[PDB]
């Protein structure tokens, strides 16, 4: 115990257990077939309709090259998903499986293969200052 | 993982049965309880290391 | 039927604009531009549809 | 009565579904609230 001179006021991020509710809503997915009544009249029909790139189109290749005009090739979703995949390939795989529907991801956000420090490791080398022998830093590495 | 798979499987239902019944309420309560419990476990492991 | 479907597309476009203003004035933000502050718990909050 | 049902009447009417594709349940509010 003694007179500690300190020179820094920033906080240290603990001691706030907040009971979190608020992520309460039904999640949204990509569906294939939906339903409609097409006019509002005495004429009315219950019609199902299936979406385009889901289950009806295929990926590009040179053997399937030009296009068939009858095929449901949804150009907007095709281009958007192409640029999305180009941007998508940069992130590593845990950050890819967080962008999936079902929750197969690790709950703790920093990954094992990227973080240099051990998660919840207990070892920390503190050298006591004693006049005499030599003081040193970074005994972990 | 089991709970989120139940959520997507039960959400893939057809039109005359897409109902916000008591099963979906309990599944949402499960998701909330699981995430609170595992975050509490994270903080407890931090304190036990300290 | 045409007018009801056209209403659905109009409210979709309106919600697109409500996203655009947030993303525009969020991504023009630079380091200590105006009115930035410490907030806390937002990195804890992840709500997603 | 044939004219007691029209498109302008059952377009108003509420027991028929006329559903959309959104599943979110919006809330209404009262002016004193």
């Amino acid at each position: 115990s003694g007179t500690l001179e300190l020179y820094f006021p920033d906080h240290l991020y603990r001691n706030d257990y907040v009971s979190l509710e608020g992520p309460r809503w039904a999640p949204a997915i990509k569906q294939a077939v939906r339903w409609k009544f097409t006019p509002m009249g005495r004429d009315a029909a219950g019609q199902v309709w299936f979406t385009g790139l889901t289950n009806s189109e295929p990926g590009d290749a040179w053997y399937k090259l030009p296009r068939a005009l009858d095929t449901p090739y949804r150009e907007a979703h095709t281009r958007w998903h192409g640029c999305f995949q180009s941007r998508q390939r940069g992130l590593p795989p845990a950050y890819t499986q967080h962008l999936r529907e079902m929750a197969f991801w690790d709950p703790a956000i920093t990954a094992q293969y990227l973080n240099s420090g051990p998660r919840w490791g207990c070892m920390q080398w503190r050298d006591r200052q004693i006049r005499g022998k030599e003081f040193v830093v970074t005994r972990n590495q | 993982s089991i709970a989120t798979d139940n959520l997507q499987c039960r959400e893939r239902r057809q039109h005359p049965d897409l109902v916000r019944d008591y099963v979906e309420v309990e599944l949402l309560k499960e998701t909330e309880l699981i995430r609170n419990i595992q975050e509490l476990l994270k903080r407890t492991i931090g304190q036990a290391v300290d | 039927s045409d007018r009801s479907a056209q209403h659905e597309l109009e409210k979709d476009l309106s919600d697109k604009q409500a996203a655009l203003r947030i993303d525009d004035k969020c991504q023009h933000l630079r380091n200590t531009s105006e009115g930035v502050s410490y907030f806390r718990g937002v990195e804890r909050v992840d709500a997603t549809v | 009565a044939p004219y007691s049902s029209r498109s302008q009447r059952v377009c108003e009417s509420t027991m028929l579904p006329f559903v959309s594709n959104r599943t979110t349940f919006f809330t209404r509010y009262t002016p004193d609230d």
Binding site: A26, R34, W35 | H15, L18, V19, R20 | S4, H7, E8 | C11, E12, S13, T14, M15, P17, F18, V19, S20, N21, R22, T23, T24, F25, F26, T27, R28
Partner: peptide
């Protein structure tokens, strides 16, 4: 009006409702 009675049935402070006046309704 049955439409006004049904929407008055559905309204509430914390009650989800699927009916939509002069438009399509929710699939759920």
């Amino acid at each position: 009006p049955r439409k006004e009675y049904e929407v008055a049935c559905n309204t509430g402070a914390y009650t989800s409702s699927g009916l939509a006046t002069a438009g399509f309704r929710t699939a759920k």
